Amino acid sequence: LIGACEFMKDRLYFATLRNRPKSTINIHYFSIDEELVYENFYADFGPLNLAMVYRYCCKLNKKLKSYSLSRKKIVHYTSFDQRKRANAAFLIGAYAVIYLKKTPEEAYRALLSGSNPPYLPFRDASFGNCTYNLTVLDCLQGIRKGLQHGFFDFETFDAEEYEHYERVENGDFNWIVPGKFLAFSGPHPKSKIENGYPLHAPEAYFPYFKKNNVTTIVRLNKKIYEAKRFTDAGFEHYDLFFIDGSTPSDNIVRRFLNICENTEGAIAVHSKAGLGRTGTLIACYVMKHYRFTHAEIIAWIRICRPGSIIGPQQHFLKEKQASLWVQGDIFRSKLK
């Protein structure tokens, strides 16, 4: 275990190993590299999504409470594939934050505690270069912030539901802020199957939305269904179009924040994929109202909905952070 990162004195370690190790009477080894696998869009490779973080933490907690392993060092290993290794490092750092009560900085210090190469930064889903480098530390800080503001709770998290509704066959949506924001791909005019691709019409969503207090739909992409189909059914509906892969005007950001601040229910936000444009505007709201940094919210939203926030949208959020924070301080003063 030379070079291994120690997370619990004489008890839990994170190791990078070129070949499969053999568990012994003294050491239990396990890897998730082939069990929890990131589903990529293009050259993005992580971070692993929230349900995969949950499944890891469940796996590890059971090992640490197991009688058969109670006298053993438990070693989470990953390989020399740096894209597997960054996700594996993210997983055990996140466990450290959630269950071992370490700060993101402590968890990350542990990840550097061996003699190991740096961890590769995560990147976006674009076809070019990505110069917004989302690090493992950023992802651990996003986890801490989500925990801090109750955006997830692994005592109640329902991974079967998460894994059900993320699928295009079941509507392709994810909660980003419980009770407040759901992100999804844009409905089509008719529920059907076209070239083996399942398409959902607005009405398909009504039961879930009504049951979960979705009062408002915000569309950010080109119109291919009549807004009336939602408003008839009782939903508020709003159009704030901006071009795929671009950043929204001040006017669009202003309008989005007013729409969301003036409902007490949840807002279902969509674009074409529900990734770039949708993630960018939700990020603006969460930076203003919860004071996430740009790195924390890009991490948090991608953990909930991989592929979210692309290309220039990333540097946009960094550029707008300071003013969104100010606008939030003003907003909260004018309360009371």
UniProtKB/Swiss-Prot annotation:
Protein name: Dual specificity protein phosphatase CDC14A
Tissues where this protein is expressed: Expressed in the inner ear.
GO cellular component, one term: stereocilium tip
Predominant place of localization: nucleus
Domain Tyrosine-protein phosphatase: 172-329
Domain comment (free text): Composed of two structurally equivalent A and B domains that adopt a dual specificity protein phosphatase (DSP) fold.
Location of the active site: S271
Residue ranges of the region described as B: 170-336
GO biological-process terms attached to the record: cell division; sensory perception of sound
Swiss-Prot/TrEMBL catalytic activity: O-phospho-L-tyrosyl-[protein] + H2O = L-tyrosyl-[protein] + phosphate; O-phospho-L-seryl-[protein] + H2O = L-seryl-[protein] + phosphate; O-phospho-L-threonyl-[protein] + H2O = L-threonyl-[protein] + phosphate
Molecular functions per Gene Ontology: protein serine/threonine phosphatase activity; protein tyrosine phosphatase activity
